[PDB]
Amino acid sequence: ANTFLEEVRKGNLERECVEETCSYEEAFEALESSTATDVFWAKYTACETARTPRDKLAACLEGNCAEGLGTNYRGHVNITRSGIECQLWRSRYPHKPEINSTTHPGADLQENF
Amino acid sequence: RIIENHGTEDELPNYCFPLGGIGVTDTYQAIKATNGNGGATTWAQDNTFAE
Amino acid sequence: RIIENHGTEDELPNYCFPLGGIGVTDTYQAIKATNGNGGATTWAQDNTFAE
Amino acid sequence: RIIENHGTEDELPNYCFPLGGIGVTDTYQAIKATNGNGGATTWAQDNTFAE
Amino acid sequence: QGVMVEQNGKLESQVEMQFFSTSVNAMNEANAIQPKLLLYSEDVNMETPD
Amino acid sequence: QGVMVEQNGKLESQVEMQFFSTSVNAMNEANAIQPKLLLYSEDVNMETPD
Ligand SMILES: [Ca+2]
Ligand SMILES: [Ca+2]
Ligand SMILES: [Ca+2]
Ligand SMILES: [Ca+2]
Ligand SMILES: [Ca+2]
Ligand SMILES: [Ca+2]
Ligand SMILES: [Ca+2]
């Protein structure tokens, strides 16, 4: 990010994106593949609530927890609040999902997690 | 023994430079102008250049 | 023809410098006298400077 | 009054340098070779050197 | 300093215009396809004397 | 080089102090506000003879 002299050397994704404040650009420079890069972008938009501080973002990129409403949740829980097993997210069995993986893959909606 | 302090002689700057003479660099992408007829011109990505 | 070499003298270093003379920097914010009372005086955001 | 131009004698370029004498560096970690069990040589993080 | 070449019985130039934007934004949404750098290209009688 | 000013018939200074911290803050626990940088400020006579 800052200290533009740094904008010469090979930046680590951590060294340029986390503790500082990177946009998509320096991240991409570090990584060079829009797939995992926009996975990172989806996290970043989700980690909009996790911009500071460090840990707040290290855990947010870890993916082991839901940020309140769980827009960041990338775990694998298959039980509801009552333990009910979840349906297939991509398919509409048995109820039609209004917003699904075709609509918002940024939340990383898996099979039934 | 005696200091003939005429002072220095300089009126121009002197500059050192990067070994390539260009430090920073912003990646970029070739763009071709597709004719916007009846409106604003459209733009696409060239295939001749590297991306 | 004859190398009357008695070396040189460079005791004082000759640092060059950058244009603005002040490279790195770091946006900071001005904490006015937003003073608490009794204990360690508090601080808070000012509105008399650019952020 | 009269100019005896010759160019100059500048056949070796001159470089300036950083005060640390080294540009930038990348934290690294030590390792050691756990003896290859016949096949691939194994590599174990050392403890002698700092992280 | 562009090279002059003859066509139509006249000597003209071969300057071309090329356009560049940020592959830096290679990825994202449409509309935002705007150029920011213009380059003029040419050919010249490169020659080193000494 | 503080421009001395006469108040009450005595020559005194006009130097003040200004305090600075980082910029992000709500980002984390708010009141966490602390001073980090101190600048003394003042006034002088600026002349460029040559
Ligand atoms: Ca930086
Ligand atoms: Ca950077
Ligand atoms: Ca930095
Ligand atoms: Ca970089
Ligand atoms: Ca760069
Ligand atoms: Ca680190
Ligand atoms: Ca770039």
Q: Is E17 on the interface with B (CB under 8 A)?
A: no
My answer on whether omega of the bond before B18 falls inside 30° of 0, hence cis, is no
What is the experimental method?
A: cryo-EM
Round to whole Å and give the CA distance between E21 and B42. 14
| Pick from F36, F12, F10: nearest CA to F22 | F36
My answer on whether omega of the bond before B13 falls inside 30° of 0, hence cis, is no
Within 8 A of C32 by CB-CB distance, chain F residues are 19
> Token digits for B16?
């050192």
- Which resolution, in Å, applies to this structure? 4.2
**What amino acid is encoded at A99 in this protein?**
I
Round to whole Å and give the CA distance between D20 and F2. 38
Q: Is F28 on the interface with C (CB under 8 A)?
A: no
Three-state secondary structure string covering C1-51 = CCCCCCCCCCCCCCCCCCCCCCCCCCCCEEEECCCCCCCCCCCEECCCCCC
Query: Is residue B27 a known part of a binding site?
Result: yes
> Token digits for F41?
């400020």
CA distance A57 to chain D (A): 22
Q: Please, which residues bridge with residue D43 across strands?
A: D33
Cβ(A19)–Cβ(A54) under 8 Å?
yes
Q: Please, what is the Cα angle at D17 between D16 and D19, to 5 degrees?
A: 135
Question: Where do we find the tokens 């503080």?
Answer: F2
Within 8 A of C28 by CB-CB distance, chain A residues are none
Q: Is A53 on the interface with F (CB under 8 A)?
A: yes
End-to-end CA distance of chain C: 68
Q: Where are the beta strands (DSSP E) in A1-113?
A: none
> Token digits for D30?
């030590």
Q: Which of C25, C34, C35, C43 to mutate to test the interface with F (most CBs of F within 10 A)?
A: C43
